[PDB]
Amino acid sequence: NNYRDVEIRAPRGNKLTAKSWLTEAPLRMLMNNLDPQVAENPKELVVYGGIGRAARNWECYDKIVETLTRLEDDETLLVQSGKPVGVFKTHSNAPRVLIANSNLVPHWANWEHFNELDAKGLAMYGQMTAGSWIYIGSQGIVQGTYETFVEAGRQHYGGSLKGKWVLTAGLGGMGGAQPLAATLAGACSLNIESQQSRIDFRLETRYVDEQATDLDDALVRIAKYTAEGKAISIALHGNAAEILPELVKRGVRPDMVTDQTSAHDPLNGYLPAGWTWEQYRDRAQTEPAAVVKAAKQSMAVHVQAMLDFQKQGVPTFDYGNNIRQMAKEEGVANAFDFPGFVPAYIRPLFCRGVGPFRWAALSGEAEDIYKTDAKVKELIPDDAHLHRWLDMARERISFQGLPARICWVGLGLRAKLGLAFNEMVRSGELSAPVVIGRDHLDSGSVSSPNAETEAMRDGSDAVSDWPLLNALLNTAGGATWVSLHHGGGVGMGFSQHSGMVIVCDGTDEAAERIARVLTNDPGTGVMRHADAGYDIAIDCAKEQGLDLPM
Amino acid sequence: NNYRDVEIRAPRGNKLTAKSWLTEAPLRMLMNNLDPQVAENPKELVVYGGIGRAARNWECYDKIVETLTRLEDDETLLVQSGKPVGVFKTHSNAPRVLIANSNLVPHWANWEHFNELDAKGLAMYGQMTAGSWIYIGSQGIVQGTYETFVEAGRQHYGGSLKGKWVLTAGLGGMGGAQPLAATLAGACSLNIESQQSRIDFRLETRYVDEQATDLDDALVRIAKYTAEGKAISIALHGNAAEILPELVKRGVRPDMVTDQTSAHDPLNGYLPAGWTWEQYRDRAQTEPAAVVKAAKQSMAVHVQAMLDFQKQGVPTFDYGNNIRQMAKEEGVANAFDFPGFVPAYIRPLFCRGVGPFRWAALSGEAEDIYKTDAKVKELIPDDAHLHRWLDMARERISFQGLPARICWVGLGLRAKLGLAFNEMVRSGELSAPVVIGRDHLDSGSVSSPNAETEAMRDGSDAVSDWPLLNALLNTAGGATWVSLHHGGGVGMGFSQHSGMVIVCDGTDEAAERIARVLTNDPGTGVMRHADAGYDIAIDCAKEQGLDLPM
Ligand SMILES: NC(=O)c1ccc[n+]([C@@H]2O[C@H](COP(=O)([O-])OP(=O)(O)OC[C@H]3O[C@@H](n4cnc5c(N)ncnc54)[C@H](O)[C@@H]3O)[C@@H](O)[C@H]2O)c1
Ligand SMILES: NC(=O)c1ccc[n+]([C@@H]2O[C@H](COP(=O)([O-])OP(=O)(O)OC[C@H]3O[C@@H](n4cnc5c(N)ncnc54)[C@H](O)[C@@H]3O)[C@@H](O)[C@H]2O)c1
Numbered sequence A, B: 001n002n003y004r005d006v007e008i009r010a011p012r013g014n015k016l017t018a019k020s021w022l023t024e025a026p027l028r029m030l031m032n033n034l035d036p037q038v039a040e041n042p043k044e045l046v047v048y049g050g051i052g053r054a055a056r057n058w059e060c061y062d063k064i065v066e067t068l069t070r071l072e073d074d075e076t077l078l079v080q081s082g083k084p085v086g087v088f089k090t091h092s093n094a095p096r097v098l099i100a101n102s103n104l105v106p107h108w109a110n111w112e113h114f115n116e117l118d119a120k121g122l123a124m125y126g127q128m129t130a131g132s133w134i135y136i137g138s139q140g141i142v143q144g145t146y147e148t149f150v151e152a153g154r155q156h157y158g159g160s161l162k163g164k165w166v167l168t169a170g171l172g173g174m175g176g177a178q179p180l181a182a183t184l185a186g187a188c189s190l191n192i193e194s195q196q197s198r199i200d201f202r203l204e205t206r207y208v209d210e211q212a213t214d215l216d217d218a219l220v221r222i223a224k225y226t227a228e229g230k231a232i233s234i235a236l237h238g239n240a241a242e243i244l245p246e247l248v249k250r251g252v253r254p255d256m257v258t259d260q261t262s263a264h265d266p267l268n269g270y271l272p273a274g275w276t277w278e279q280y281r282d283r284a285q286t287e288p289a290a291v292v293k294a295a296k297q298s299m300a301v302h303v304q305a306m307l308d309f310q311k312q313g314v315p316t317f318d319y320g321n322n323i324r325q326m327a328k329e330e331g332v333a334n335a336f337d338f339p340g341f342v343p344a345y346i347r348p349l350f351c352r353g354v355g356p357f358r359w360a361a362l363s364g365e366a367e368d369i370y371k372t373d374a375k376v377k378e379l380i381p382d383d384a385h386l387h388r389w390l391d392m393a394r395e396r397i398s399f400q401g402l403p404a405r406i407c408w409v410g411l412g413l414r415a416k417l418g419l420a421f422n423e424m425v426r427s428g429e430l431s432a433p434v435v436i437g438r439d440h441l442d443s444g445s446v447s448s449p450n451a452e453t454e455a456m457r458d459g460s461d462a463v464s465d466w467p468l469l470n471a472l473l474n475t476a477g478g479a480t481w482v483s484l485h486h487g488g489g490v491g492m493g494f495s496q497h498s499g500m501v502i503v504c505d506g507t508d509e510a511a512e513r514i515a516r517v518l519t520n521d522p523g524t525g526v527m528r529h530a531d532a533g534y535d536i537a538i539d540c541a542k543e544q545g546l547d548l549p550m
C-alpha cells in the first residue's frame, strides 16, 4: 500500500520524459524527493520529518507520474493530499501544478483526525517540502541551522564558538544537518540519535564526523576536542529523554542546547524513554493512544531537562519541532520559558526577506551548481558572509540526489540570481534547466505561533492570511508549481504555510515570470514583517520600493 | 475608526473612477456591499452574519478604495483581513485583488483569539461574501433556502407544501430570506426575530408578509392561512430560545423546523433568553466571557426544543449557523440527532456543480438584469423549474442596491451564461459590464463538517484541501478577484472556503478567462464530490468531459 521495494531517482540529462521542461521539472523533483541518497524512508514514500510523504500512496504516485508526463503547457494538475485529483485548463503563465496537502478544518486539525482519515486512505502529511517536491536532503535546512548557531554565538559568546559545544538530538533528514551546521559555526556537538541507521545515514553523507561508544566516551571526546579548539560533530546512539536528564544530574554543562527530534508527531516521531524504535513502531499500530501518551510523557521529562540547562545559564531554544507545546500539554507549565529559534535568532533575516532560498540542477551535473555558485559570488561581490558560505558548501556539503544549493538571500537578490540563472540556461552555460524554490519556512510563507511567527511584536502570531496570500500571489505571478500545506514542522493544528518552485528554462517567457515571482515571493515576507511594525522590514520595503498601501 | 455616519452606494452608469472595468468592478461591489439597502449595519461596516465586515475599519476602507482607484492592469492588490497591505506586479490575466480574511492557525482558530486580535486592530471577520464583496442582499441566499424547502417538501410531504408551515428564527440579512423562500415554496411560516428593526427591514424589502402581535395571534394566523392553502410568512418579535420551548410545551406541531439566528458567534449574534438586545450589546463588551456563556446556554434550550419537535416526527434540520455544535458543547449530547441542510437536502445539487451562481449589473439599471433573465431562459429553454424561478424572482424579489440575480445552475451552463452575458456587454445590449460571482457556499469552494461537507459518504468532512485548490485554480484561470476565508457561516474554527468573481466587460480577453474559470470553478465541485464517490458527480464529470486522473 505505502510500501514498494524500488529505488527511485530523478532522470538526468536533457532528454525530456514529460512534454516540456515546465512539466519535466516537477516530475524530476518528485522523484528526487524519493532518491535513496535523499529521502529517509522512500520505499514507504517518506521523505522526512516523521511521515512527510511525496505522494499519498504508490497507486497515487504512479498516477502523478503518468499524469505529469501527459500534462499540456496550458493545463494545470491539482494534487490533493498526495493524489492527482484533476486537470484543468489555465494558461502557459499559470502554475502547471497546484498542491494542497494535509489541510483540515481547524476544529478537526489534529493528528487523531488525520490518522483516522489516513486509515481511510484520505490523507497524506506533506510536511513542508515533502509533499511539494522541493526537498534536497539535509542541505535544505543546514544553512538555517548554521545561521541559528552563528547568531546564538554572537549573542552569547561574543562571536566565535571555538572551544564550545552544542547538545542536541535528532539525526533524521533535517536534524542530521545539526552536526555539520555546528561544525561550520566553529563548535563541537553531541548529537543523540535513537536509530543506528540514521547515524549511519549522516555518516555516509558526511554530516556528522564520528560516533561515540557510550555517554562517558562521548563526553571524553567533547572534552578533548573542545580543549583543542576543534569543531567535530559526535553522534551518540540513545534516547534524548534519558540522556539529557542524566547529563543534568551529572552537572554537565553544554554551551547551548536545543532539540530536533520529530516531537511534532508523538505517534511516529518521538521515542518514549526505554523503548526501542522497533517496539515504538509496532505498538503505534496496536495502542496508538497509549504510544502517543508515552511519547509526550518523555517529551515532558526532555523539556524539563532543557529548562534545567537554561536555569544553569546555558542558551537554550526550541528549534521548530513543537516539543515545548507537547511538554506543556503534559504538565510542564513553564515549558515556554525558553524561546523558539526565530524570535530569538533569525527574525531579523526574515525582515529583509532572507530565507532558505534554493535551486537544483535538473541535469544532475555537479558542475551546473558550481557554475551557479560562481555566478552568485559575481552577482553579490561584497558579501563576505555569503562568499564564505558558498565556499563552505562547496568544501563541506556533499550533493544528495540532483546537485542542489542552499543559499540564504532576500528581497532584491533572489530575482537578480533567478534572471541570471535563466540566462545561463539559455546560453548553454548550464547544461539543463534549473529549478528555484525554498522551504516553506521563509519570510512571508508561514504562520506558526510556536516557530516562525512566535512572539510577533504586534501579537499577530496566529494570523494565517499571509501564507494563503503568498500562494495566491505566486499562482498569479507564474511560479511553476505552488502549494498550501498544513502542520509542516510543528505538526497538525499549529501551522499553515505555502511553497513555490519556478523553472528557469532559459526562455523569455520564464524570465518574465521569474522577475515578478522572485520579487513578490520574498516581497510578501518583507510586507508581512513591515505590517507587524519591524523597522528592519519597513526600511527594506522602502529601499526595495515595495508598494505597501498602508 | 469603526463607525462612520455616511451612506455608501455603488457608483452608477458607465463613468469609471478606476483605471478600467476590472478595477472599477471590485470598487463598485465593495461599496454595494455597504449600500443602506443591502447591508445590515453599514455604518459599522457590518454587512451580515453577526459581525461580517467589508473592510477592517474606515481608515482601511478609504485606503482600499484609494488603491483600487489607481491600481494598474498588471497590478494585484493584496487584502489581508480587510486591509490593503500590498500591491505587486502580476499580469492582466491574473486577479486584480487577492483576498484572505479571518484565517487563523488551527490551534488558535476560535472567537476568543479572534476578538483579542480584533481589539488590537488586527482582524476582520469576512463571513463569506461580506469581506469578498459579492453580497447582493437577501437575494443571495433566498433561492438556496427555497431549494432546501422544496426538496424537504418532496422528501416529506409529497412535493408541493400546500397547507404546511415552517417554524424558524432569525430575520437578519440571510435569515430574512427564509420567510420569502417558504412562501415561494408554497408554505406559510412563523419567523421569530428579536430585533424590531430587522423585522422592519424584511417587511420593507418584501421578504416577510406580516407581523403577528404575539404567539397566540401568530398561531391563529398560521392555523387560518394553513387551512386555507395560502402561503404567507409571519414575523413574531421575540426570542426563539423562549418561543420554541413554549410551542413544544403547547403541543404545537410545525411541518418543518429549522433556525437561522447568528448562533455561530455567541458574543454578537445570539440573544440570551430574557435579555433585551440593549443589555446584550452592552454586556458584550463588559463581560464578554459571561455573555458567551449566557448565549450558549440559551442555544442549548433552543436546540433541545428542536430535538423535541423531531421526536414528534417533525422534519428538523440545521441551516448552517452551527447551533447544534454550540448546544452539544453546552451538554446537549444528542444535538446532532437532526441533520444539516446539505447532506439532507442540497448535496445532490452540489454533485452537479449547481449552487448560488449570480451576477450583478454594475450599471445599476434593472432592465440589464431583465435582459439577462430573458437571455437565461433562451439558453436554458427546457428547464421549467429554472424559468419558474426567474418569473418568481421578477415577481417577488425586490432589487437591493445594484440590480442582481441569483440563479442556481451548475457545471456547463455557468460558462454558457457567462460567455453570453459578456457578448451582451460587447454588443451594447447590456448598459455596462456585469460581474459574475457566487457565495462561498458552493460545490467545490467550502469544507465545513457541520454544514456544506457534513456527512460526506467517505468521511472526508474536514478535508479543506479542496477550497484552497479552488482559490488557487481560480487565480490561475483568470477570475477578477479571488478570496480565501475562514469561519464563514459556522464561525471561527468550523469552515474554510474560497470565493471568486469575474467581470464580463465585453472583451475577448475577458471571454477566454470566462470560458476557463466558469468551467473550472464548478468543475472542482464535481471533482470534489466525484472523489468522495457520489455517482451523480462521477456521471456529471463524464458528461462534461472533466479530466480527473484517478
Ligand atoms: N521549524 C521549521 O520550519 C522546521 C524545519 C525543518 C524541520 N523541522 C522539524 O525538525 C524535526 C526533525 O526533522 P527530521 O526531518 O530530522 O525528522 P525525522 O523524522 O526525519 O528524524 C527525526 C529523528 O529523531 C529521532 N528521535 C526521535 N525520538 C528520539 C529520542 N527520544 N532520542 C533520540 N532521537 C530520537 C528519530 O530516530 C529520527 O531519526 C521535525 O519535528 C521537523 O518537523 C522544523
Ligand atoms: N451555511 C451557510 O453557508 C450559511 C449561509 C448564509 C448564512 N448562514 C448563517 O445564518 C445565520 C444568520 O445569518 P444572517 O445574515 O441573518 O446574520 P445576522 O447577524 O444579519 O442576523 C441574525 C438575526 O438573528 C436574530 N436573533 C439572534 N438571536 C435570536 C434569538 N434568540 N431569537 C430571535 N432572534 C434572534 C438577530 O436579531 C438577527 O436579526 C448566521 O449564522 C450565518 O452565518 C449560513
Ligand SMILES: O=C(O)/C=C/c1c[nH]cn1
Pocket (backbone or CB within 6 Å): A049, A127, A128, A129, A134, A135, A136, A139, A140, A141, A174, A439, A440, A441, A488, A489
Ligand atoms: O529544508 C527543507 O527542504 C524543508 C524543511 C522543513 C521545514 N519544515 C518542515 N520541513
Ligand SMILES: O=C(O)/C=C/c1c[nH]cn1
Pocket (backbone or CB within 6 Å): B049, B127, B128, B129, B134, B135, B136, B137, B140, B141, B174, B356, B439, B440, B441, B488, B489
Ligand atoms: O449569499 C451570500 O451573499 C453569502 C451568504 C453566506 C454564506 N455563508 C455565510 N453567509
